């Protein structure tokens, strides 16, 4: 409580200098490599500029916690709380835009002003609910509070519950789609190899004809995986493959086991030349798209697991415990530093590009 007031201006200042420096390097990477910027990137860069705006607002909180009481005016306090609320709402709705963009990209300026502009609307409840109360010998600036409560509840529902269910639907759909695509790809490849071994070790034409049936159904499925020259090299390599299965099913229908096994030995040449080369090409593209989603998943999970308890504490307390207030306050203020940390560990686009900045 009173002891906890002593450690947080050291922690918030350390949050301030690392959080300021962490996100300018992101936004100076955004100005040096504008050719490779992306939708997600732009939304992530807007989250970074909201983070350095919060980094500028942090030293006011540092002095206000170091003095033990609020020194500046009420305009400053509701400016600080509105800046924190616009940071939270900007992060939530930019992750909403990222989720929508990645859903419409995988399953299937003028944006940035809208997401920033819409965040002022939901943070307008913070501008009127917060006032400096001089109670119990302490002049502290905390929110306290029928139409205003209805406006707060409607804005809370519309800005939080719809994007959270929208995220937990969309990102699970992305993960399930990517994992089932990899599972279908590997199942088709394992069918094509295992039934080839079955044909090679077979003795009677009943299992040769039955294994080619399973090979033809998997080679027809793997052709649907995929006007480019690489597009013509993929599908024509499967038209040879299914066309060579039909040359062995026709031989196995005549009752020739040894001629069917020799004709299915030529399926190894097409599998090595046309199939295995684009098996690894399609596999490595799926592992890259999984790794990009795993960065976005870690960004969403860090943002909610840090900012949701402080938002629930301030909503419960103002509607109606000393240790949980300062723990939740430093947890949501810690998020300003955790965002460029995640871009430096698993953030492959940021890490390789920032290393080129140090060379230049």
């Amino acid at each position, epitope marked *: 409580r009173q002891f906890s007031r002593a450690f947080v201006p050291i922690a918030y200042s350390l949050i301030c200098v690392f959080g300021l420096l962490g996100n300018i390097l992101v936004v100076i990477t955004f100005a040096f490599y504008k050719k490779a910027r992306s939708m997600t990137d732009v939304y992530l860069a807007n989250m970074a500029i909201a983070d350095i705006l919060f980094a500028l607002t942090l030293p006011f909180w540092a002095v206000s916690h170091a003095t033990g009481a609020w020194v500046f005016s009420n305009a400053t306090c509701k400016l600080l709380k509105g800046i924190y609320a616009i940071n939270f709402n900007c992060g939530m709705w930019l992750l909403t835009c990222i989720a929508m963009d990645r859903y419409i990209a995988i399953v299937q300026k003028i944006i940035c002003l809208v997401v920033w502009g819409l965040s002022v609307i939901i943070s307008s409840s913070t501008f009127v609910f917060n006032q400096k109360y001089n109670t119990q010998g302490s002049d502290v600036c905390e929110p306290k509070y029928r139409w205003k409560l209805l406006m707060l509840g409607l804005e809370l529902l519309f800005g939080f519950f719809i994007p959270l269910m929208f995220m937990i639907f969309c990102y699970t759909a992305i993960v399930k789609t990517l994992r089932r695509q990899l599972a279908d790809l590997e199942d088709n490849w394992e069918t094509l190899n295992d039934n080839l071994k079955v044909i090679e070790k077979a003795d009677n034409a009943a299992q040769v004809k*039955d294994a080619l*049936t*399973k090979m*033809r*159904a*998997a080679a*027809l*499925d793997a052709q*649907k995986a995929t006007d480019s020259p690489e597009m013509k090299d993929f599908r024509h390599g499967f*038209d040879i493959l*299914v*066309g060579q299965i*039909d040359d062995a*099913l*026709k031989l196995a*229908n005549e009752g020739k086991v040894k001629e069917a096994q020799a004709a299915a030995e030529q399926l190894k040449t097409t599998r090595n030349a046309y199939i295995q080369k684009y098996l690894e090409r399609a596999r490595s593209t799926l592992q890259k798209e999984v790794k990009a989603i795993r960065v976005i998943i870690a960004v969403v999970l860090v943002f909610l697991a840090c900012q949701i308890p402080h938002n629930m504490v301030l909503l419960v307390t103002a509607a109606n415990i000393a240790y949980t207030k300062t723990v939740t306050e430093v947890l949501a203020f810690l998020h300003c530093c955790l965002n460029p940390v995640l871009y430096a560990f698993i953030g492959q686009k940021f890490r390789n590009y920032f290393l080129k900045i140090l060379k230049d």
Partner: antibody, heavy 124, light 109 residues
Framework: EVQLVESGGGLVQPGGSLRLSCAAS????????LHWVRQAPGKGLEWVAY????????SYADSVKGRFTISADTSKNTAYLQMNSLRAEDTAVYYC?????????????????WGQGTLVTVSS | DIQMTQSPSSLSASVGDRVTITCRAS??????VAWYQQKPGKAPKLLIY???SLYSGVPSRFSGSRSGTDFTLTISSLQPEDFATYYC??????????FGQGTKVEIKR
């Protein structure tokens, strides 16, 4: 338009023989495999046999293997289903359908154009 | 050795209904499934090929879908002409084609 007609259906004794026809007009048999499909009176469709005029490859169902023999004649653009040892379960309507060749979209349109079928009835 | 199991053996519906006929393959047959319509006393007509693509000539109220080895023919709006028998067929190879049992669509009364 292109079409397939059928002929040779009729009434025979059990154990007899009958050669059906399927005159294809408007397209060539060297572009399409010709199939014979069977529908018993009151029952569903059942595949019998097919013929690949180009590669000469042919196949039959289990119930018609050995007794049935299908040939092609590209000079007259016809197909023949010679049926011998006609048991009592072979009285049906016979349809002659066409099917394209791998690769491409002609293979994916399975039995796009049919014939009107002929009734083959076996009874003593 | 690949069996198609057309589940509704008979169907009764009125004009304007949306009906769904389901078929199930014994093995995987990729998307090589066709849907045919036969009126009584006439040859079958191809409606759906490659399990989703409606044939050039049939109306657009017919649609097809694939979920694993479960294939579905959907008629969005019934019509007097719609009533007929419908067959699901797998065509994985020339010598392995098999039809479904059939589904007679009748008039609800």
């Amino acid at each position: 338009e292109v079409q397939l007609v059928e002929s040779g259906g009729g009434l025979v004794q059990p154990g007899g023989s009958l050669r059906l026809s399927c005159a294809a007009s408007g397209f060539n048999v060297v572009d399409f495999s010709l199939h014979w499909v069977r529908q018993a009176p009151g029952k569903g469709l059942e595949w019998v046999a097919y013929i690949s005029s180009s590669s000469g490859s042919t196949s039959y169902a289990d119930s018609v293997k050995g007794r049935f023999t299908i040939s092609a004649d590209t000079s007259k653009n016809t197909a023949y289903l010679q049926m011998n040892s006609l048991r009592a379960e072979d009285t049906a309507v016979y349809y002659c359908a066409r099917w394209g060749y791998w690769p491409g979209e002609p293979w994916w349109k399975a039995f796009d154009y049919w014939g009107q079928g002929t009734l083959v009835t076996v009874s003593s | 050795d690949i069996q198609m199991t057309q589940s509704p053996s008979s169907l009764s519906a009125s004009v304007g209904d949306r009906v769904t006929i389901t078929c199930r393959a014994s093995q995987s047959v990729s998307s090589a499934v066709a849907w045919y319509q036969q009126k009584p006393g006439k040859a079958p007509k191809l409606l759906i090929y490659s399990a989703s693509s409606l044939y050039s000539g049939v109306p657009s109220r017919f649609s097809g879908s694939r979920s694993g080895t479960d294939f579905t023919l959907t008629i969005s709006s019934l019509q007097p002409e719609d009533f007929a028998t419908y067959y699901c067929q797998q065509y994985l190879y020339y010598s392995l084609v098999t039809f479904g049992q059939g589904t007679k669509v009748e008039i609800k009364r």
